[model samples]
Target: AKIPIKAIKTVGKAVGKGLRAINIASTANDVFNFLKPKKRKA
Candidate 1:
């Protein structure tokens, strides 16, 4: 999938959330899941 602005925002929020966690997960997907978008194709 081509990267959208939504992906950028998602990544930023996910990174912020991940950094806040004291016991961080090995993967960013975990954090990204919470910030996951509903849908996008634009």
Candidate 2:
């Protein structure tokens, strides 16, 4: 059996988008935490 080129291209595009989203979310989270105030310990 042979796979279609279009299907492969679609999968690649989806994978790229997913990776980009993950990267963006991670960056945002890091920035948010950096700016967040920390609780003081006695």
Candidate 3:
């Protein structure tokens, strides 16, 4: 995926920090899980 420089530039450093944390995640699936919406249990 491309780096969203525009978002970070527009939002300032907080977004950059979050993006950094996303980078720190060991695997792509871990980040996907973190970002994906939670499914409800019936």
Candidate with top TM-score is: 2
TM-score for candidate 2, residues paired by index: 0.54
Ranking of all candidate structures by their lDDT, best first: 2, 1, 3
State the lDDT of candidate 2 residue by residue for 1-42, as single tens digits: 366797898899999899989989999999979876676453
**Ranking 1 against 3 by lDDT, winner:** 1
**RMSD of model 3 against the true structure:** 12.0
Q: Using TM-score as the measure, name the better of candidate 2 and candidate 3.
A: 2
Candidate 3, residues 1-42: lDDT per residue as tens digits? Answer: 466897667687877778877777656768768766666453
Q: What tens digits encode model 1's per-residue C-alpha lDDT throughout 1-42?
A: 887988999999897887866346545557868676786654
Q: In what order do the candidates fall by TM-score, top score first?
A: 2, 1, 3
lDDT (Cα atoms) of all candidates against the true structure: 0.74, 0.85, 0.72
**In model 3, which runs have C-alpha deviations exceeding 4 angstroms?**
1-10, 26-42
After superposing candidate 2 on the true structure, give the runs of residues whose Cα lies further than 4 Å from its correct spot. Answer: 1-5, 37-42
